[PDB]
Amino acid sequence: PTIQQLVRKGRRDKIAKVKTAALKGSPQRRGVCTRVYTTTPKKPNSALRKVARVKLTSQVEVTAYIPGEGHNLQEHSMVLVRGGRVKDLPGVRYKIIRGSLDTQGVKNRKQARSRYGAKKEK
Amino acid sequence: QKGPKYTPAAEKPRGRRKTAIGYVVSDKMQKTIVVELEDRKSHPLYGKIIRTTKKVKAHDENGEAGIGDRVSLMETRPLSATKRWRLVEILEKA
Amino acid sequence: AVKIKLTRLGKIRNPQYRIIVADARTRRDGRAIEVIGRYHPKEEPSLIQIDSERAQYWLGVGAQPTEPVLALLKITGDWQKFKGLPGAEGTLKVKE
Amino acid sequence: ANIKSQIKRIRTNERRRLRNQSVKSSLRTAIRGFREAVDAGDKDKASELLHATSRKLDKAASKGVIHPNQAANKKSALALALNKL
RNA sequence: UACUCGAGUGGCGAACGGGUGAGUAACACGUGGGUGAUCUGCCCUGCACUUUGGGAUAAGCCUGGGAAACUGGGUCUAAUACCGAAUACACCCUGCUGGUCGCAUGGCCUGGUAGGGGAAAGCUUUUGCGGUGUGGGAUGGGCCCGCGGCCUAUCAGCUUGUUGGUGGGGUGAUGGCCUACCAAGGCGACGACGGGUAGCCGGCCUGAGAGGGUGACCGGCCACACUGGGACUGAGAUACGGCCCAGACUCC
Ligand SMILES: [Mg+2]
Ligand SMILES: [Mg+2]
Ligand SMILES: [Mg+2]
Ligand SMILES: [Mg+2]
Ligand SMILES: [Mg+2]
Ligand SMILES: [Mg+2]
Ligand SMILES: [Mg+2]
Ligand SMILES: [Mg+2]
Ligand SMILES: [Mg+2]
Ligand SMILES: [Mg+2]
Ligand SMILES: [Mg+2]
Ligand SMILES: [Mg+2]
Ligand SMILES: [Mg+2]
Ligand SMILES: [Mg+2]
Ligand SMILES: [Mg+2]
Ligand SMILES: [Mg+2]
Ligand SMILES: [Mg+2]
Ligand SMILES: [Mg+2]
Ligand SMILES: [Mg+2]
Ligand SMILES: [Mg+2]
Ligand SMILES: [Mg+2]
Ligand SMILES: [Mg+2]
Ligand SMILES: [Mg+2]
Ligand SMILES: [Mg+2]
Ligand SMILES: [Mg+2]
Ligand SMILES: [Mg+2]
Ligand SMILES: [Mg+2]
Numbered sequence: 001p002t003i004q005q006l007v008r009k010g011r012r013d014k015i016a017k018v019k020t021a022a023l024k025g026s027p028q029r030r031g032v033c034t035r036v037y038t039t040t041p042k043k044p045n046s047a048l049r050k051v052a053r054v055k056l057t058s059q060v061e062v063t064a065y066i067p068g069e070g071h072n073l074q075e076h077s078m079v080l081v082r083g084g085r086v087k088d089l090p091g092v093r094y095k096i097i098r099g100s101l102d103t104q105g106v107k108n109r110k111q112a113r114s115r116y117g118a119k120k121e122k
Numbered sequence: 123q124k125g126p127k128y129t130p131a132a133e134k135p136r137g138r139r140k141t142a143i144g145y146v147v148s149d150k151m152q153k154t155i156v157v158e159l160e161d162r163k164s165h166p167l168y169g170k171i172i173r174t175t176k177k178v179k180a181h182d183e184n185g186e187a188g189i190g191d192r193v194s195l196m197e198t199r200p201l202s203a204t205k206r207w208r209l210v211e212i213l214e215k216a
Numbered sequence: 217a218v219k220i221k222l223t224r225l226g227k228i229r230n231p232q233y234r235i236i237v238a239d240a241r242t243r244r245d246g247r248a249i250e251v252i253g254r255y256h257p258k259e260e261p262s263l264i265q266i267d268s269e270r271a272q273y274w275l276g277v278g279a280q281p282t283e284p285v286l287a288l289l290k291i292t293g294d295w296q297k298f299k300g301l302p303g304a305e306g307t308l309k310v311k312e
Numbered sequence: 313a314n315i316k317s318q319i320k321r322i323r324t325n326e327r328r329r330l331r332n333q334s335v336k337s338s339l340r341t342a343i344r345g346f347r348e349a350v351d352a353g354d355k356d357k358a359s360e361l362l363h364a365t366s367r368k369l370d371k372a373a374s375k376g377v378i379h380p381n382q383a384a385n386k387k388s389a390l391a392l393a394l395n396k397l
Numbered sequence: 398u399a400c401u402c403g404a405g406u407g408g409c410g411a412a413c414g415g416g417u418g419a420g421u422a423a424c425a426c427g428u429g430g431g432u433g434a435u436c437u438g439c440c441c442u443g444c445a446c447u448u449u450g451g452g453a454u455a456a457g458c459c460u461g462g463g464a465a466a467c468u469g470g471g472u473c474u475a476a477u478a479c480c481g482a483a484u485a486c487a488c489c490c491u492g493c494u495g496g497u498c499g500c501a502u503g504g505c506c507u508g509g510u511a512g513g514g515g516a517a518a519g520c521u522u523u524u525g526c527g528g529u530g531u532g533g534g535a536u537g538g539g540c541c542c543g544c545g546g547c548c549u550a551u552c553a554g555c556u557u558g559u560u561g562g563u564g565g566g567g568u569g570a571u572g573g574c575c576u577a578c579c580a581a582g583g584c585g586a587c588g589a590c591g592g593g594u595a596g597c598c599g600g601c602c603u604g605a606g607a608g609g610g611u612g613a614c615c616g617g618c619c620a621c622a623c624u625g626g627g628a629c630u631g632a633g634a635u636a637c638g639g640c641c642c643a644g645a646c647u648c649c
């Protein structure tokens with residue numbers, strides 16, 4: 001690109017491929033569950049995972065992934081959601097923190113307790 | 123301790139009022155002329171010098187300036203919307 | 217009448233007061249035309265330094281200092297110099 | 313209005329508007345009469361009206377209703393119109 | 398009794414300081430001039446004067462309306478509240494005559510000349526403070542100036558007080574600030590006007606660097622005050638807790 005072309009056109013930088021559209025730039029959004037169901041990951045990995053469809057304060061319909069092993073989520077349960085991709089599920093881009101609001105951390109966890117929100121032993 | 127009505131205010135002389143030079147382009151005015159200035163500058167990022175011209179218009183009450191002539195400028199009083207620059211003296215005509 | 221102010225900056229638990237000659241019309245932290253020093257009581261000596269010549273020129277040009285500023289100027293002896301009564305008295309306790 | 317100081321200020325401002333409107337209307341009537349004399353086209357009566365109007369204009373300006381340089385401005389403009397006609 | 402004081406004027410102060418960023422791409426912002434085109438109380442500092450007569454109103458008392466806020470009618474009292482006149486002749490304007498500078502009308506030597514015009518208020522007898530004009534200066538301010546400072550031509554022509562002249566009106570100050578008439582132009586592909594975005598900057602994060610992002614606090618400016626407008630007061634109004642009108646909100 002010659003100098004005159006540079007002056008004529010200006011150099012345009014990449015437009016960011018923004019991910020995690022739901023929070024619209026927020027580190028957190030609060031939502032209410034609409035359904036609880038299961039889905040089958042892509043061909044390389046087959047399983048039966050648990051995903052929840054939640055209504056957001058930002059009025060966006062996006063599924064979220066259910067961590068841990070056991071959950072107490074039934075339809076119309078206020079929940080908390082964070083940002084994170086998931087490759088096994090193609091239409092999933094969100095997690096659901098445990099130990100906050102009505103979602104508690106699965107019992108019997110002592111390793112990586114902080115990530116799932118569990119208390120100590122006594 | 124009397125004293126007349128002679129407690130004045132501060133002084134201020136006259137200093138530098140903008141002076142420039144350029145070429146006249148449109149003479150179809152009446153006792154008014156528009157001039158263009160040639161200046162050089164380098165891009166803040168590229169480092170390549172840049173030669174761009176801005177649009178200006180001066181004053182003449184008699185219109186002795188023809189199309190395509192070089193003139194000098196002195197900032198006079200605001201006299202019309204968008205026009206405040208007044209010609210001092212002609213440097214050449216064509 | 218531009219008065220000798222004490223510009224303030226910094227944080228809460230340690231205020232700062234720079235000696236500024238400015239008009240009282242602006243904010244307390246507003247336009248500072250000329251700075252001649254600062255004043256801070258947080259330190260026990262609370263050392264203060266004054267430029268006698270600039271202070272005197274401002275006084276003669278028409279800036280009336282505020283009462284604490286004038287008192288501190290007497291302490292530094294600048295008021296004594298301007299009055300010419302006792303002369304120039306140096307008693308400031310330079311910090312140990 | 314919720315403070316005694318501000319309410320008192322509003323009272324005082326209304327009083328001084330009554331006063332200033334009176335004075336300014338008088339000045340405007342003087343200038344209007346001068347204008348009427350000029351577009352009628354008289355000389356000596358025009359000059360006498362100039363005298364009276366200038367005296368009252370200066371009185372008002374010194375009182376502070378209007379401002380000195382502009383007072384000189386319209387007085388000298390009127391003198392210029394008179395000398396022109 | 399005045400030690401003292403409710404309120405009552407009169408002032409002065411209230412345009413301070415504190416808050417917020419919705420709009421705003423603009424001389425809105427940083428820096429650089431400015432003005433022989435403006436003002437500016439309260440501060441100091443050299444330098445004339447402050448004679449004189451008059452009247453009214455609040456407050457108060459009475460009456461009346463009205464829950465109310467609020468209001469009127471009548472009597473009465475004073476003034477750093479008010480106005481006339483005395484002068485001014487150094488200041489503001491106009492018709493006649495030199496030198497300096499040139500960056501031009503013209504400025505300065507208060508250049509000389511004839512006319513006419515114009516201001517004040519007292520308080521304390523003690524580190525004594527007040528009023529009016531302007532040769533000296535400062536500050537706060539206004540105007541406009543080169544440059545600059547998002548993205549979108551899948552926004553290309555826009556603009557009629559719009560663009561300039563003359564004349565009037567207008568401003569603290571030149572100017573379409575406003576008016577009338579003349580000419581048809583001015584702005585436009587070295588991106589006009591259009592659309593979405595968003596207070597600007599000294600700065601904060603990053604990067605060796607250029608550069609990218611960004612505007613937390615502090616601070617320099619800007620704009621805003623339930624939404625839309627307008628005006629009075631003065632040296633100083635976008636007048637946040639100043640005024641009026643219209644809508645919404647809440648309440649009596
Ligand atoms: Mg003097
Ligand atoms: Mg003076
Ligand atoms: Mg200046
Ligand atoms: Mg402030
Ligand atoms: Mg000490
Ligand atoms: Mg004290
Ligand atoms: Mg209340
Ligand atoms: Mg009237
Ligand atoms: Mg009328
Ligand atoms: Mg006045
Ligand atoms: Mg004029
Ligand atoms: Mg004229
Ligand atoms: Mg009392
Ligand atoms: Mg005040
Ligand atoms: Mg006010
Ligand atoms: Mg205010
Ligand atoms: Mg703040
Ligand atoms: Mg906030
Ligand atoms: Mg805003
Ligand atoms: Mg713009
Ligand atoms: Mg400037
Ligand atoms: Mg003032
Ligand atoms: Mg008298
Ligand atoms: Mg009475
Ligand atoms: Mg008496
Ligand atoms: Mg008199
Ligand atoms: Mg006299």
Ligand SMILES: [Mg+2]
């Ligand atoms: Mg005379």
Ligand SMILES: [Mg+2]
């Ligand atoms: Mg003389």
Ligand SMILES: [Mg+2]
Binds near residue numbers: 518519
């Ligand atoms: Mg008096």
Ligand SMILES: [Mg+2]
Binds near residue numbers: 430542
């Ligand atoms: Mg400039």
Ligand SMILES: [Mg+2]
Binds near residue numbers: 544
């Ligand atoms: Mg610039």
Ligand SMILES: [Mg+2]
Binds near residue numbers: 564
């Ligand atoms: Mg004209």
Ligand SMILES: [Mg+2]
């Ligand atoms: Mg003119």
Ligand SMILES: [Mg+2]
Binds near residue numbers: 201202203572573
């Ligand atoms: Mg104009």
Ligand SMILES: [Mg+2]
Binds near residue numbers: 576577
């Ligand atoms: Mg006209």
Ligand SMILES: [Mg+2]
Binds near residue numbers: 596
């Ligand atoms: Mg904004």
Ligand SMILES: [Mg+2]
């Ligand atoms: Mg920087």
Ligand SMILES: [Mg+2]
Binds near residue numbers: 604605606
């Ligand atoms: Mg680098």
Ligand SMILES: [Mg+2]
Binds near residue numbers: 607608
């Ligand atoms: Mg770089």
Ligand SMILES: [Mg+2]
Binds near residue numbers: 612
């Ligand atoms: Mg920025």
Ligand SMILES: [Mg+2]
Binds near residue numbers: 245246616
């Ligand atoms: Mg600040």
Ligand SMILES: [Mg+2]
Binds near residue numbers: 616
């Ligand atoms: Mg700031």
